[PDB]
Design a protein around this ligand. Structure first.
Ligand code: A1B73
Lengths: 232, 195, 213, 230, 211, 233, 242, 206, 230
């Protein structure tokens, strides 16, 4: 209305990024867990209709062969960010002939965010939270980025509507030493507790990047069926 | 090197070309398909010259005419198509020329069957008969001799057989394989003639 | 007359890999036509503690290219928080050289290093950025003299009785013999040679005097 | 003041630029950082922000050049832009010439970059304050501000709860000049501790000085120093 | 240089020599002239090694971005079109490329010849480089679609051998790769063609062979 | 406003300009798209003044290229310019790839353009929603629905425009996966006539196959309208 | 409402933004230039930094120079003044590139005045908040001192003061004619005037909060900052007098 | 040599209350191959303004399209026919706008200036718009020397329409019979203030 | 500049015990025409840096103007004597200028010598610099002295002695034979005079009217120009 996009609040906070931080609270809940064997990203898919093609809406995407990501907030803005991330990761691979570090990909993603500030072109903040998981030379890792441009590495993290309860459950149940299978069980139990559904196949989406192939793997019905049967 | 031939009568138009893909001294193919560019709505652009220039210009013209016809939901007239092709060829003439020779054939209800001869300098005119390439020198007079306005399509194909046989007998490049587009009676037909 | 922007300043750079080491020896003479600017101008530049680059051609282009590669490697270290190995630096050098495809650096390059798996590696480069890995290489004025010698010693293709068991000391002495032969037969090679040995402990430099005529 | 704080090019009736002041106000919410020096060394310490139990600490200090490092307080994206600018300037000076950049020239260029964003209505001041530690013929500590000013200090600190650190530095400034490196590190860590316990995770600590490129102190040495402080 | 590719009953055979030269001098005999564009597409090099290597890597980057965006494996036709347009955009700046792109996609096995002049030609049999005519003559003499994999590999090896025997620009080692529906296999990773002369042409080895 | 940010975040985190574009969509004519084994049916409301307005001139069912078609709901002129941009991109893809544009690529591009217009200074958002029916590279048929925000999703059957929710809940209770052609046009017609007045002049229905998009002749629409009159009494 | 843009005149024919800039400058640190018999002496009193104790000794210096023979100082914001001084150095560089001689002082003053004035014309540019003194001295021409105001006005003086407490400094400086007093004798008078005028300044912060420079015969008519050996007896005599 | 590629020639002549323009109908290729025998080089701009464009055929078509565009915009803006002298000056300016990359064309303009009095108007051009107005006749093309000789010998002042037609036709045909790269039919337009007579001559086809 | 029209001949610079001695005759030739015979070809950059040229005079004057403004801008930013740019800094700057112009195919038709004293630890001449107005010489280590060469292609290096033009054959042979470290002023003068004598006899573009310039602890001293003895 009256304040420009670059206006500072009296507290020293940009109005637009503060407002964009309300958009990330909306959306479907997702969780990421990092352990020594690899990183898992789980997500709920709130399917609005039976007529929608379920695989057409993707909450978990692959920024690269070794990078997965879960998005929350405005989905179109999220897809814009992930497309930019894919382009720049492939540019890094072409220029250097190696897989990009997860931190570098997160940093360039957060550099595209806040491009509207025009410090040195987008018009506004992106209003997107991303949990970017991956496996680089320094092992598996998970990062969290938000419209303010801050990046934060996490052992375990959550995004979306039920971020608070998900992070509470993760804080209670996460350990640094748990195995990959226990990490999958923890992720699906957190999603079970925060969801309002019976947690069937074609109700959650699961992906993982392990330290055996360092390759993005999108799960299928057999894998969610296995982990669900393993759940207590 | 790419022999193109065109013959227009009252009830048809026929285009023909050798089917050889040349790379230095070797024929890459004897069944080349980078010369004819069939456009939607009874239209054909037969291109000669360099294969890369042929591909670039032919696809450029094809994608522009298709964009026109889908944007406007009508079939572009053959005269408009021919003069658009000439205009675009002449636009690039003084900036990175397309070294391509063109026969532009089509059918309209407004103007009937139509043939246009156009060279690499974008010098264009409507013709009843025309030819391009070195082989033009060996076929044009045949087209002059046996043509008449009331030709049937079969008689035109016999004339093209005479042209192909002369190109085999006398031309330095003993061109044996030919492809033909026959536009008549609101249908477009493809034929392949050996020898 | 139009001014020609390229000059060959002469001199040789020889490279030879081992199993877990690599030797790169370069002469230090700097010349123009049949005169000598100076008898000491190093052609080999350190890039990382397990990677160096030597070059032969125009000295201004060589110096600018080596400084550019060093600058981009420091930028890489600051941005991505790890030193790039020889293969990353090799692709980077290829991209940098091809970025001036239509006005190339007047330099032929040898990138020598020890990779993460403790394997000696050489990459050889023409001006425009085409490059390949090799077990032995030579660039500069005397390269046509020395490449047959390296072929005969290393590969032994035309020898039924093959002695393919080499160690670091014999390789160093053989590289000294090779650069000595290049000095004998190439006018642009002489004065002094700097021999870099890269192995597990890192880079070590040694000097050998050569003929000054 | 609601009329005059709306655009960054408007002076208030008291001759104040309120948007630049708000950019400065953004700096006090950052975590505390401290920098001191002796005759030979500059020691920088900082509190790494940790936003939750499962988080890792936010990085507080960054290497610019072999004898130049920084710490930041405020909006971290602005700090990243300034960090990349400074690193590029240092490497460009090392590329064109064969010498280290002059620290005063680098700080002036950063301050010019700060000021150029205060002039146009289509730009905002960088909402971040940098402390710049270097050794260029002597230990040196600089500070930059959103308004395009800069200053040089014998000792510096800013961020959240930096007033206690400033009081400790005011008391103990006369000792730092003759302090050895170990005593200097202990003094900087104590000044940081006044702002609060400290931990190897949550404590950034780096040194630069004579015959000593910029180096973050290792976790084991940091553990020894934190044990000595307690 | 000599590169060739041909389609046959069990997919595509690709074959190359490994010589790189600067005028009369042989700069290398270990050059890798077959590049994995992706898991299902291979690309050859003939002419300017710098341009071929750089633009085939660039094509690989574009194909990676396309596949990641669309969740689909690109066709050989689309990759060939992208490469031909990229090379045509630099018409007149002296790029020198002769490339055979061959692979498997949802439309089956495909093979395209593309050069620096914007050329793009679909076929079942191509050869490029200074020894291309010799490989063409050998292949056209002996090519049959129903060759087995061993027969096709042996034919490719023989064609490369005769090209290296006649052409001064070709030599070193012969490599022969086989593209099938689920990737490609290096059937002959590298074989010194010194042995192939004393296999095919002069098996007795009791005197200098007289051409 | 050459480059002024028109779309900005409200204090609650919403983008109000996108919401107003959605309101503009809600005022537009209703469109419905239904998928089948190897064909789709698209039906659009049309309102014209009888005896004065030329009914041919207003095409809300549009052929984008060889194999893709588009329905829309919202501002007509915005629809025209975006559709022309989409046609240009279709032919640009077919130039650069030598294969026709897949439907998923076209839907992604339309969503990208809409998102871009929500995120660039000095441009208003597109006040339209679209239903894009077409064929994938593997010849599977698909329908993609896109919103003013730039969000898109693929649907078995979907409706956009005014009173789209009632048509959606109808299609949920009446869509039966693979269907013959006649029952598919019948489902589309009754679904759109839940909200639209029941007459043949108030609907335009077309069927997309691999070969072409064919508009159903008005006699069939008249007969099916009479049948729908019959079943309601 | 009329005071929200520099590019709007108020009903009584005034630009309020420039007046607010004047108010900003009058609250900032004091600067003065004074023509003397053998030179010009420039002095910047940074009384605002009396609070900050950890600032390095004599690091903050508002006195700069152009061509090693023109002093340039300011009162106002540091960044804006650095922008103006960079423009002055650029103008000197361009003038020497064109003509191979140094820029005359009045030409430089006019060009910098136009540069300052241009930012008071448009609705999107912040006007510079700084008053700029530019001065020089020569053996033949004696001293030329100019003060450029934030509105673009430039005026020549024999002595000038800007910033905080400038009225008291002007009153004390006006008590006697300095064109027949040398700079070395003038330093004591400047220290006495600072002690009597600025209440924050005292004996214990004169040595580290005041920048001094001059151009006179002793400096060969070129820029120099006063050494501690010349400053210390002068401030000691001023403190003993006071 | 660029003008020899297609060949071609245009002529114009004046009489009393009448004017005439004429041209050959050949489109040649590479200076010797005839590829069309109906390529008319005369173009109607309006009822009192005609232009004869000889030279390279692509530039003939391009210039005719530009002139048609400009004339149609002028006439629709002003709601009146363009004056022949205004058109001639416009053609000069258009040809000079491409001075360093000229259209390889040598136009003539033939028409009636209106004053109602219908005065004949003839002018000839070079490729960059240098124009010369004449009262008797104008010539351009590769056959310019032969046309100049024929018109100098045979031109008769103030002929009627029939005499003008016979004189211009004989001039054109005799000039074309001595030129290899022009001929293959001849178009002759005779304008009078009430009508136009278009004729095709029984010309040589060599 | 397409090519040379007004040309300066050789320049010879050497290190000796008190600093740099650089010599050049004062002739500029218009082809075979000795049009100008009192030209200055050794330019002062700063108190510890001088520049000499061989080749086209216009390009050399342009470079001299560039280095003059570079020195003035350096002085404007100076706060201590260590901030003054060294001869190697100017050598790198000139090499970069020549390299970029070579890349543009717009070369300066010159060979340039940049010579001087790298170290500030021998005098306090830079504490109070005088641009418009001008004890025993201190012995200076050769490591603290700098002489650097640049050519048209940007080929740049340094040595204990440098020659340009015809001196690269005549003077440089005698220098490589007879040069020794830590020569006195008299020995350096005698060697330079011998080199210039040979050049005067064998270089047609050379003159016997010499300009000598000395860079020492007391700055840059332009000797009174003299005719070659004997
Ligand atoms: O071949 C030689 N060495 C081994 C090398 N192999 C390569 C190389 C080989 C294959 C490939 C690829 F195809 F697999 F990609 C890529 C690169 C570059 S170098 C020397 C033979 C004589 C000529 N020569 C010189 O250096 C002469 O000096 C130059 C210096 C600068 C310019 N003026 C003359 C190189």
């Amino acid at each position: 209305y009256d304040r420009g996009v670059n206006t500072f609040s009296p507290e020293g906070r940009l109005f637009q990024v503060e407002y964009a931080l309300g958009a990330i609270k909306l959306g479907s809940t997702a969780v990421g867990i990092c352990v020594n064997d690899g990183v898992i990203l789980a997500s709920e898919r709130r399917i609005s209709s039976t007529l929608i093609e379920k695989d057409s809406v993707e909450k978990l995407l692959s920024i690269d062969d070794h990078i997965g990501c879960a998005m929350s907030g405005l989905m179109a803005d999220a897809r814009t960010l992930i497309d930019y991330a894919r382009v720049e990761c492939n540019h890094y691979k072409f220029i250097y002939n190696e897989n990009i570090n997860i931190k570098s990909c997160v940093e360039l993603i957060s550099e595209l965010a806040l491009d509207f500030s025009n410090l040195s072109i987008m018009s506004r903040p992106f209003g997107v939270a991303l949990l970017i998981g991956g496996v680089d030379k320094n092992g598996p890792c998970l990062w969290y980025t938000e419209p303010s441009g801050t990046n934060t590495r996490f052992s375990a993290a959550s995004i979306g509507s039920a971020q608070e309860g998900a992070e509470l459950l993760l804080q209670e149940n996460y350990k640094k030493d748990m195995t990959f299978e226990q990490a999958e069980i923890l992720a699906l139990t957190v999603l079970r507790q925060v969801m309002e559904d019976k947690l069937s196949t074609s109700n959650v989406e699961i992906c993982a990047i392990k330290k055996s192939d360092q390759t993005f793997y999108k799960y299928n019905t057999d894998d969610i069926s296995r982990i669900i049967d393993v759940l207590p | 090197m790419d022999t193109l031939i065109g013959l227009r009568g009252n009830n048809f138009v026929v285009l023909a070309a050798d089917t050889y893909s040349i790379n230095s001294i070797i024929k890459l193919k004897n069944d080349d398909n980078t010369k004819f560019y069939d456009i939607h709505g009874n239209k054909c652009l037969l291109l000669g010259g360099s294969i890369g220039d042929r591909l670039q210009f032919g696809e450029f013209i094809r994608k522009n005419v298709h964009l026109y016809q889908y944007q406007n939901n009508t079939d572009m007239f053959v005269k408009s198509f021919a003069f658009f092709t000439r205009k675009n060829l002449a636009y690039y003439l003084r900036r990175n020329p397309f070294e391509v020779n063109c026969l532009i054939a089509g059918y309209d209800k407004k103007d009937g069957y139509q043939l246009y001869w156009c060279d690499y300098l974008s010098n264009m005119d409507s013709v009843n008969k025309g030819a391009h390439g070195y082989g033009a020198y060996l076929v044009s007079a045949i087209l002059d001799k046996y043509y008449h306005e009331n030709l049937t399509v079969d008689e035109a194909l016999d004339i093209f057989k005479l042209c192909f046989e002369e190109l085999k007998k006398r031309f330095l490049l003993t061109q044996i394989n030919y492809e033909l587009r026959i536009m008549y009676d609101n249908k477009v037909e493809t034929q392949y003639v050996t020898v | 007359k139009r001014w020609y922007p390229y000059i060959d300043n002469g001199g040789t750079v020889i490279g030879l890999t081992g199993k877990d080491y690599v030797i790169l020896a370069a002469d230090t003479r700097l010349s123009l036509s049949y005169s000598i600017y100076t008898r000491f101008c190093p052609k080999i530049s350190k890039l990382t503690d397990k990677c160096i680059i030597g070059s032969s051609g125009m000295q201004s282009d060589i110096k600018t290219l080596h400084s550019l590669l060093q600058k981009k490697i420091q930028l890489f270290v600051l941005e991505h928080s790890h030193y790039p190995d020889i293969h990353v630096i090799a692709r980077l050098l290829c991209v940098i050289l091809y970025s001036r495809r239509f006005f190339p650096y007047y330099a032929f390059n040898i990138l020598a290093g020890v990779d993460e798996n403790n394997k000696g590696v050489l990459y050889n480069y023409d001006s425009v950025g085409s490059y390949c890995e090799a077990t032995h290489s030579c660039v500069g004025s005397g390269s046509q003299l020395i490449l047959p010698i390296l072929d005969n010693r290393v590969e032994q293709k035309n020898q039924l009785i093959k002695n393919t068991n080499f160690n670091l000391g014999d390789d160093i002495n053989f590289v000294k013999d090779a650069i000595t032969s290049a000095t004998e037969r190439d006018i642009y090679t002489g004065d002094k040679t700097l021999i870099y040995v890269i192995d597990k402990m890192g880079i070590n430099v040694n000097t050998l005097d050569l003929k000054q005529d | 003041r609601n009329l005059y704080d709306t655009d960054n090019i408007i002076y208030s009736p008291e001759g104040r630029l309120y948007q630049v002041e708000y950019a400065s106000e953004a700096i006090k919410q950052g975590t505390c950082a401290v920098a001191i020096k002796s005759k030979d060394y500059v020691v920088v310490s900082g509190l790494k922000k940790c936003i939750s139990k499962l988080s890792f600490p936010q990085e507080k200090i960054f290497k610019i050049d072999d004898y130049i490092g920084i710490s930041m307080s405020g909006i971290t994206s602005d700090a990243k832009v300034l960090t990349k600018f400074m690193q590029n300037e240092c490497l460009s000076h090392k590329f064109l010439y064969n010498e280290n950049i002059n620290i005063e020239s680098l700080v002036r260029s950063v301050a010019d970059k700060y000021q150029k964003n205060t002039q146009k209505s289509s730009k905002r001041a960088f909402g971040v304050g940098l402390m710049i530690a270097a050794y260029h013929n002597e230990p040196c500590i600089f500070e930059t501000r959103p308004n395009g000013s800069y200053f040089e200090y014998d000792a510096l600190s800013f961020g959240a709860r930096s007033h206690a650190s400033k009081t400790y530095l005011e008391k103990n400034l006369h000792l730092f000049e003759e302090c050895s490196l170990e005593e200097l590190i202990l003094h900087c860590l104590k000044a940081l501790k006044c702002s609060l316990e400290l931990t190897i995770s949550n404590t950034a600590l780096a040194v630069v000085g004579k015959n000593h490129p910029w180096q973050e102190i290792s976790s084991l040495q940091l553990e020894e120093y934190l044990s000595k402080v307690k | 240089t000599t590169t060739l590719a041909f389609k046959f009953k069990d997919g595509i055979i690709v074959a190359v020599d490994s010589r790189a030269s600067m005028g009369s001098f042989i700069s290398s005999q270990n050059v890798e002239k077959i590049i994995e564009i992706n898991k299902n597409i291979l690309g050859t090099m003939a002419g300017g090694a710098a341009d071929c290597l750089y633009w085939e890597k660039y094509l690989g980057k574009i194909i990676k971005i396309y596949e990641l965006r669309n969740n689909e494996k690109i066709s050989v036709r689309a990759a060939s079109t992208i490469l031909s347009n990229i090379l045509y955009q630099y018409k007149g700046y002296g790029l020198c490329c002769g490339i055979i792109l061959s692979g498997y996609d949802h439309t089956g096995f495909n093979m395209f010849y593309v050069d620096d002049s914007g050329k793009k030609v679909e076929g079942n049999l191509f050869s490029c480089g200074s020894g291309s005519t010799y490989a063409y003559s050998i292949l056209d003499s002996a090519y049959d679609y129903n060759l087995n994999l061993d027969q096709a590999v042996e034919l490719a090896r023989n064609a490369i051998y005769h090209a290296t025997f006649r052409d001064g620009g070709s030599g070193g080692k012969v490599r022969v790769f086989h593209i099938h529906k689920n990737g490609y296999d290096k059937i002959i990773e590298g074989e010194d063609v010194f042995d192939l002369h004393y296999h095919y042409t002069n098996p007795e080895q009791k005197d200098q062979y007289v051409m | 406003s050459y480059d002024r940010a028109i779309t900005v975040f409200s204090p609650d985190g919403h983008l109000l300009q996108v919401e107003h574009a959605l309101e503009a969509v809600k005022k537009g004519g209703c469109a419905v798209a239904i998928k089948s084994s190897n064909f789709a049916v698209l039906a659009v409301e049309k309102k014209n003044i009888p005896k004065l307005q030329n009914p041919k001139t207003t095409e809300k069912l549009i052929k984008l290229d060889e194999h893709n078609c588009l329905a829309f709901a919202g501002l007509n002129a915005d629809a025209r310019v975006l559709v022309n941009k989409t046609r240009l991109e279709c032919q640009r893809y077919y130039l650069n790839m030598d294969e026709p544009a897949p439907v998923d690529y076209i839907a992604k591009y339309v969503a990208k353009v809409q998102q871009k217009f929500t995120h660039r200074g000095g441009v208003r958002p597109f006040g339209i929603a679209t239903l894009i029916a077409g064929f994938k590279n593997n010849k599977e048929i698909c329908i993609y629905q896109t919103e003013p925000s730039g969000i898109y999703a693929a649907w078995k059957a979907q409706a956009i425009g005014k009173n789209a929710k009632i048509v959606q809940e109808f299609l949920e209770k009446n869509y039966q996966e693979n269907m013959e052609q006649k029952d598919c046009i019948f489902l589309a017609l009754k679904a759109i006539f839940e909200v639209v007045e029941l007459s043949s002049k108030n609907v335009e229905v077309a069927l997309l196959t691999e070969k072409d998009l064919t508009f159903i002749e008005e006699q069939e629409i008249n007969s099916m309208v009479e049948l729908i009159d019959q079943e309601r009494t | 409402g009329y005071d929200l843009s520099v590019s709007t005149f108020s009903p009584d024919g005034r630009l309020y933004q420039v007046e607010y800039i004047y108010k900003s400058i009058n609250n900032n640190n004091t600067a003065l230039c004074l023509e003397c018999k053998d030179g010009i002496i420039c002095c910047c009193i940074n009384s605002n930094m009396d609070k900050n104790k950890m600032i390095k000794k004599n690091s903050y210096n508002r006195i700069y120079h152009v061509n090693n023979n023109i002093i340039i100082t300011y009162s106002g914001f540091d960044g804006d003044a650095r922008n103006i001084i960079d423009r002055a150095r650029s103008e000197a560089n361009t003038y020497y590139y064109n003509f191979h001689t140094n820029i005359p002082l009045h030409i430089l003053v006019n060009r910098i005045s136009l540069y300052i004035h241009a930012y008071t014309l448009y609705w999107h540019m912040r006007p510079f908040a700084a008053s700029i003194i530019i001065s020089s001295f020569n053996e033949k021409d004696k001293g030329d001192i100019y003060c450029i105001e934030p509105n673009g006005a430039c005026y020549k003086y024999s002595g000038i003061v800007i910033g905080k407490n400038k009225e008291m400094f002007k009153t004390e400086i006006e008590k006697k004619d300095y064109k027949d007093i040398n700079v070395r004798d003038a330093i004591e008078d400047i220290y006495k005037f600072i002690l009597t005028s600025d209440d924050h300044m005292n004996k214990n912060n004169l040595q580290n909060l005041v920048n001094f420079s001059w151009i006179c015969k002793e400096s060969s008519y070129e820029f120099q900052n006063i050494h501690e050996e010349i400053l210390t007896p002068a401030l000691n005599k001023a403190v003993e007098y006071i | 040599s660029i003008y020899n590629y297609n060949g071609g020639c245009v002529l114009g002549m004046s009489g009393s209350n009448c004017v005439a323009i004429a041209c050959d109908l050949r489109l040649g290729a590479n200076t010797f191959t005839t590829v069309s025998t109906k390529f008319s080089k005369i173009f109607k701009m309006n009822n009192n303004v005609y232009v004869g464009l000889s030279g390279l055929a692509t530039d003939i078509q391009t210039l005719y399209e530009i002139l048609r565009y400009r004339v149609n915009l002028y006439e629709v803006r002003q709601d009146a026919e363009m004056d022949v002298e205004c058109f001639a000056n416009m053609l000069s300016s258009i040809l000079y706008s491409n001075r360093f990359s000229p259209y390889f064309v040598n136009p003539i303009v033939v028409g009636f200036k209106l004053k109602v009095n219908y005065e004949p108007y003839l002018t000839a051009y070079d490729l960059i718009g240098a124009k010369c107005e004449t009262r008797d006749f104008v010539v351009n093309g590769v056959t310019s020397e032969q046309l100049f000789g024929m018109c100098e010998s045979l031109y008769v002042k103030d002929q009627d329409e029939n005499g003008l037609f016979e004189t211009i036709s004989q001039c054109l045909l005799s000039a074309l019979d001595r030129d290899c790269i022009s001929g293959w039919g001849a178009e002759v337009l005779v304008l009078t203030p009430e009508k136009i007579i278009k004729k095709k001559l029984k010309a040589r086809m060599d | 500049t397409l090519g040379p029209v007004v040309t300066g001949t050789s320049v010879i610079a050497i290190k000796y015990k008190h600093g740099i001695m650089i010599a050049a005759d004062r002739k500029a030739s218009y082809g075979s025409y000795a049009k100008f015979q009192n030209v200055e070809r050794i330019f002062k950059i700063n108190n510890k840096t001088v520049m000499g040229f061989s080749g086209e005079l216009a390009d050399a004057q342009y470079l001299h103007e560039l280095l003059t403004r570079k020195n003035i801008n350096n002085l404007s930013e100076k706060k201590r004597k260590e901030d003054m740019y060294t001869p190697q800094h100017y050598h790198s700057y000139v090499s970069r200028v020549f390299y970029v112009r070579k890349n543009r195919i717009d070369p300066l038709f010159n060979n340039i010598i940049i010579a001087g004293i790298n170290s500030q630890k021998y005098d306090n001449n830079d504490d109070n610099v005088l641009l418009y107005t001008n004890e025993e010489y201190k012995e200076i280590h050769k490591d603290d002295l700098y002489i650097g060469f640049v050519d048209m292609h940007g080929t740049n290096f340094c040595d204990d002695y440098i020659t340009t033009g015809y001196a690269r054959y005549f003077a440089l042979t005698l220098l490589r034979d007879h040069y020794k470290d830590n020569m006195t002023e008299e020995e350096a003068r005698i060697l330079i005079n011998e080199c210039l004598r040979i050049l005067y006899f064998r270089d047609a573009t050379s003159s016997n009217f010499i300009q000598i310039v000395k860079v020492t602890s007391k700055g840059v001293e332009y000797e009174e120009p003299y005719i070659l003895p004997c």
